[model samples]
Target: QHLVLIGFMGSGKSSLAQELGLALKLEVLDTDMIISERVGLSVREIFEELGEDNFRMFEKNLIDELKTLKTPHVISTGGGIVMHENLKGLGTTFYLKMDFETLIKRLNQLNNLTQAKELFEKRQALYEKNASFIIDARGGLNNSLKQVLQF
Candidate 1:
């Protein structure tokens, strides 16, 4: 089965996915990057041009595409991808939990508070309900990655 990383933005999903994928010798797929490439635009560009709603629609489409992959890939999904019930079945989902303070700090560093809050509020419940496990991500990236991999 595939491993799906689900969490709030800046929870280190992408970073941890790279580490875990290398350790586990699994292919890694990042849905956001895929969406960006498919649309020929950066995420910031998508947000500025088409708005969050349209971007999310594209994200959902990307999730659908991921479901067909035959390999046991590691997917670092957008924070909101789990919001759609249909998308939850695409992999063995893990919630990369982190303290709100950490999330806030990360968001601030990325200059992405608005988008972070918007996605967080919209998908919080779905993440709680759909995740197969919750891996605390606050201790540090390596520790969190080890915990999730062991789980």
Candidate 2:
């Protein structure tokens, strides 16, 4: 199984996945990046153009494709990847935990905070319930790498 990272947006899942991949000498894959590549759109653009359901359908298909991989990889998933649920079994899942205050602060660059907070509330439990471990993201990336390396 791959080392799959799941969490809400602004959780640093992407950064951790890249760092972990470097540390472990493994290839890094991001579901969102792959989806964007396949669809010729950014994640946000895809969501805006195709609607949430269609974007999610693409995610589901990507998960299915991941099932056929011959080599293990470090996977950084989209914020809403947990919506599919079955991703937990994809690997030793880790949820990057962050307080809403910190999350919103980090996500300030976004155009909309209302929907961000709403989705954060909705997805928090899904990330928690699906993850095999939790990384306190407030401590930052170096701390996170240490925790992941320990496992």
Candidate 3:
């Protein structure tokens, strides 16, 4: 089993996973980073060049590969991980929540705000469906981390 964090692109899943893993003394694994390394490209470039379909295949492949792990680690997944419902059963999954306003503030600098909003809306229910717990990360990282620690 593992502690998995799932949420939107700017929802702090990566940062929280890093801090939580450090505090809990577990190794941290990031799906996005792993995929990026394997593909020799940034996630943006992968989507731009290889396309979303290919990127999703990488995500699925990585998820399948994770089934091989026998020890616990803290896993921070890409925003779209919920797209792979089979990702369930590997561990406890947390959906780190931040309202769209906050998420847009962080994400607007990079992508089309409207598309991000659409994606965020589409993924909210999916995140909820997949999560073992929902951490209201609007309270800030320390509070969010504390909540995960209590579990």
Among these predictions, the greatest lDDT belongs to 3
Residue range with the least summed lDDT across 10 consecutive positions in model 3: 104-113
Candidates ranked by TM-score: 3, 2, 1
The better-scoring model by lDDT among 1 and 3 is 3
Cα lDDT, model 3, residue 8: 87
State the lDDT at 123 in candidate 2: 84
- lDDT per model, in order? 0.84, 0.87, 0.90
Relative to the unseen true structure, what is the C-alpha lDDT of residue 123 in candidate 1, on a scale of 0 to 100?
71
Q: Rank the candidates by lDDT, best first.
A: 3, 2, 1
Q: Model 3, 67-109: lDDT tens per residue?
A: 7899889999988888886788868999999999988777766
Q: Which of the predicted structures, 1 or 2, would earn the higher lDDT when compared with the native?
A: 2
Alpha carbon deviation, residue 27, candidate 3 (Å) = 0.5
Candidate 3 residue 19 C-alpha distance from true site, Å: 0.9
Please report, as a residue range, the 10-residue window in candidate 1 with the lowest summed lDDT: 116-125
Every model's TM-score: 0.86, 0.90, 0.90
